[PDB]
A paper describes a structure:
To provide a structural framework for understanding the activity of SalBIII, we have solved the X-ray crystal structure of SalBIII at 1.8 Å resolution. Phases were determined by molecular replacement. There are two protomers in the asymmetric unit, consistent with the fact that SalBIII is a homodimer in solution. Each subunit adopts the cone-shaped α+β barrel fold first recognized in the structure of scytalone dehydratase[10a] in which three or four α-helices pack against the concave side of a curved five- or six-stranded mixed β-pleated sheet, creating a largely hydrophobic active site cavity, closed at one end. The most similar 3D structures to that of SalBIII are those of the MonB-type epoxide hydrolases, but sequence alignment shows that in SalBIII one of the two catalytic residues (Asp38 and Glu65 in Lsd19/LasB N-terminal domain) is missing, and overall its sequence diverges significantly from other members of this family. Using the crystal structure of SalBIII as a guide, eight residues were identified as contributing to its active site: Tyr14, Asp38, Arg45, Tyr54, Asn58, Ile65, Asp104, and Trp121. In contrast, alteration of either Asp38 or Asp104 (to either Ala or Asn) gave wholly inactive mutants. These residues are suitably placed in the active site to operate as a catalytic dyad, to accomplish both dehydration and oxa-conjugate addition. Superimposition of the modeled active site structure of Cyc11 and that of Lsd19/LasB C-terminal domain[10e] onto the active site of SalBIII shows that they occupy exactly equivalent positions.
The enzyme SalBIII from the salinomycin biosynthetic pathway resembles other polyether epoxide hydrolases/cyclases of the MonB family, but SalBIII plays no role in the conventional cascade of ring opening/closing. Using this metabolite in vitro as a substrate analogue, SalBIII has been shown to form pyran ring A. We have determined the X-ray crystal structure of SalBIII, and structure-guided mutagenesis of putative active-site residues has identified Asp38 and Asp104 as an essential catalytic dyad. The demonstrated pyran synthase activity of SalBIII further extends the impressive catalytic versatility of α+β barrel fold proteins.
Numbering used by the authors:
A (entry chain A): 1 to 129
B (entry chain B): 1 to 134
Write the structure that this text describes.
């Protein structure tokens, strides 16, 4: 959306749906050709198949997100927000929960669909206990 | 810097120097043709010059920054951080401060210098806060 408030509300709803773990509902928030860059500097994920794989991987990892303040850009489409993500590695037989402190930047269409997400987190943004 | 900890330590210094009000020292942390886009979307300063227009008006605005956690990109150069910036309230200079909740994204050089900064904040990211207990 181009209205800041409404734009933020769509991102808030995205995090609610990540938390709910409902892949189909999450994927439908994105445009069909939306790109996801997670982490920033690795391979860009592009289109529906890649989104699906990425969100299945997140729900499988039992991700929970606690978002910080949602900041709007003044470009009619961006939202940027620091978050704490917690998740489990499904290959770890101890299923140990890890925290990642990340920053997400979204851009949205004027109809309110997400068309890019970039996720900043590095090796040194990961914590345990 | 390509090493995440080093890259972060540099941005940590940037905020320290901003809070110190030392325009000389701040401007220097940038490269010659660094772009500062603040706010994102009403772009886009470029150049050693406009970085002094920039840093001088921050000092004039009595800006203080409280950064949160510094996250790194895995692109060998980005740092991204949510912060709270407080400054003078011109509508009520003496009684209140304006607070903006923003996200900064920096990209840095392999030497340690800032090439770009995009500061995300909107009209809905501004609060007014009590400033004195007179």
């Amino acid at each position: 959306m181009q209205d800041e408030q409404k734009r933020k509300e769509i991102v808030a709803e995205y995090f609610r749906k990540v938390n709910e773990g409902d892949v189909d509902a999450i994927v439908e928030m994105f445009t069909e050709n939306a790109t996801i860059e997670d982490p920033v500097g690795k391979d860009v994920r592009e289109g529906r198949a890649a989104q699906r794989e990425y969100f299945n991987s997140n729900v499988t990892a039992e991700v929970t997100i606690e978002p910080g303040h949602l900041s709007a850009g003044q470009d009619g489409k961006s939202v940027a927000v620091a978050l704490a993500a917690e998740m489990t590695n499904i290959l770890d037989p101890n299923r140990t929960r890890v925290k990642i402190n990340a920053v997400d930047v979204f851009t949205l269409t004027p109809e309110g669909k997400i068309d890019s997400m970039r996720v900043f987190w590095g090796m040194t943004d990961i914590g345990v206990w």
